[PDB]
From a paper:
In this structure, HeV M 84KKIR87 occupied the P2–P5 sites of IMPα3, formed 14 hydrogen bonds, 1 salt bridge, 99 non-bonded contacts, and exhibited a buried surface area of 812 Å2. Similar to the IMPα2 interface, K84 also formed interactions at the IMPα3 P2 site, involving Gly145, Thr150, and Asp187. The minor binding site of IMPα2 was also occupied by electron density that corresponds to HeV M NLS1 residues 81GKRK84; however, the binding of excess peptide in the minor site is a common and well-described phenomenon in the literature. Since the residues bound at the HeV NLS were identical in the NiV sequence, we did not solve the structure of the NiV NLS1 bound to IMPα.
The henipavirus matrix protein (M), which drives viral assembly and budding of the virion, also performs non-structural functions as a type I interferon antagonist. Based on the NiV and HeV M X-ray crystal structures and cell-based assays, M possesses a putative monopartite nuclear localization signal (NLS) (residues 82KRKKIR87; NLS1 HeV), positioned on an exposed flexible loop and typical of how many NLSs bind importin alpha (IMPα), and a putative bipartite NLS (244RR-10X-KRK258; NLS2 HeV), positioned within an α-helix that is far less typical. In this pathway, proteins generally display a classical NLS consisting of either one (monopartite) or two (bipartite) clusters of basic residues that bind with high affinity to the acidic pockets on the concave surface of the adaptor protein IMPα.
Author numbering:
A (entry chain A): 72 to 482
B (entry chain B): 81 to 91
Write the structure that this text describes.
């Protein structure tokens, strides 16, 4: 019965009270459909929140914070009810408890509260949770607790609009740089996903990340044995290289391109796609970065992915080679045309997506404009792969820019 | 990963 537990949870008999709070925790935890609504409806929230402050009996503190965590793990109305019961300041107090399982359940409850949205996040931030949370980053703390701490940090960084206060982000960044020195896969994955979220906001936070000196620790994770770490690190470093050429070169100076042969040939199509997206952002930069790409001998592999890769990887590879054509040297475009580029490039002129067609058209046009001297040789190659057929068929494309560009480059 | 987590077992 759901009334007996709330009736016994207020009993002055400490044994029966702790048993009842434990039974409430069990009802909220073990099952797939916890009866959170009826439990709140019976008035258990104030009882649990006032059990939170009984320093005399830490087991009761633990069980109460546990039940509150599992209540806050549900809908936004239930997390907001936990918050309305003024449990956040009590969790912030429990952070300093000498009993580490109580202090860990407090962190878990705070993480569930922060995960609801920017409002609860900014409430918990304004009450000063960042520094007491980061004080747990030490070898003494067991790795389960540190995993929960890294998860709370991820929840702190996950929402971009409205973003957490830049002061809090500045306080968080060194903690992430400390956590990235870890070996545990879950901690590393969470740290790198938090870095990925932070880099999403724009070039300001990209520069903030770079100033932390964490890129030297993040880049080598592209070759980690665990593929989850690999995809997380690839996302983060791609976000970074979407920034200015100096930021991209900061990433490149850690020798990131060394880690990409194993990515362009990875068995998972997703890692291929993300690697070619990274390299496409690299080719859009200065000609020094294009030459750095060519030096690592990555051009043949991105050509091969353009040829025989999955659809999204093919789109990213078309983007890579087209940015290369736009911001590349005549000799480098010749290097491209030399490595069987145009035959597999022209087979994507038939796809339904209009952006890929626009991109391949502009790429071919700009290589022909870049090499008008010896264009007579290049144009005959298109006939071999049946590319001229698809170009004169594109002349009938619906949107105007594609057809007018086909007409414009028929020369 | 997940934004909210439910704790089932303690040790």
């Amino acid at each position: 019965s759901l009334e007996a537990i709330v009736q016994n949870a207020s009993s002055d008999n400490q044994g029966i009270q702790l048993s009842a709070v434990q039974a409430a925790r069990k009802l909220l935890s073990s099952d797939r459909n916890p009866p959170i609504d009826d439990l709140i409806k019976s008035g258990i929230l104030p009882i649990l929140v006032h059990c939170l402050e009984r320093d005399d009996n830490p087991s009761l503190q633990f069980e109460a914070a546990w039940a509150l965590t599992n209540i806050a793990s549900g809908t936004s109305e239930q997390t907001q009810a936990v918050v309305q019961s003024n449990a956040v300041p009590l969790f912030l107090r429990l952070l300093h408890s000498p009993h580490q399982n109580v202090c860990e359940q407090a962190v878990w409850a705070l993480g569930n509260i922060i995960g609801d949205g920017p409002q609860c996040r900014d409430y918990v931030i304004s009450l000063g949770v960042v520094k007491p949370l980061l004080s747990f980053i030490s070898p003494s703390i067991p790795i389960t607790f540190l995993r929960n701490v890294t998860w709370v940090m991820v929840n702190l960084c996950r929402h971009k609009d409205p973003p957490p206060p830049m002061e809090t982000i500045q306080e968080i960044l060194p903690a992430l740089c400390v956590l990235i020195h870890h070996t545990d896969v879950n901690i590393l994955v969470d740290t790198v996903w938090a870095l990925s979220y932070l880099t999403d906001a724009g070039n300001e936070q990209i520069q903030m990340v770079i100033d932390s000196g964490i890129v030297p620790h993040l880049v080598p994770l592209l070759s980690h044995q665990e593929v989850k770490v690999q995809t997380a690190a690839l996302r983060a470093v791609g976000n970074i290289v979407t920034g200015t050429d100096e930021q991209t070169q900061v990433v490149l100076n850690c020798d990131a391109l060394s880690h990409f042969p194993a990515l362009l040939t990875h068995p998972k199509e997703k890692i291929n796609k993300e690697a070619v997206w990274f390299l496409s952002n690299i080719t859009a930069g200065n000609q020094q970065q294009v030459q750095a790409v060519i030096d690592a001998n990555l051009v043949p592999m991105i050509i091969h992915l353009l040829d025989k890769g999955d659809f999204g990887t093919q789109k990213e590879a078309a983007w890579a080679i087209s940015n290369l054509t736009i911001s590349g040297r005549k000799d480098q475009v010749a290097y491209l045309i030399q490595q069987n580029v145009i035959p597999p490039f022209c087979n994507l002129l038939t796809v339904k997506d209009a952006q890929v067609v626009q991109v391949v058209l502009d790429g071919l046009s700009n290589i022909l404009k870049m090499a008008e001297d010896e264009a007579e040789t290049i144009g005959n190659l298109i006939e071999e792969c049946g590319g001229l057929e698809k170009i004169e068929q594109l002349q009938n494309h619906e949107n105007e820019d594609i057809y007018k560009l086909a007409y414009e480059i028929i020369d | 990963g997940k934004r909210k987590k439910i704790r089932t077992i303690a040790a």
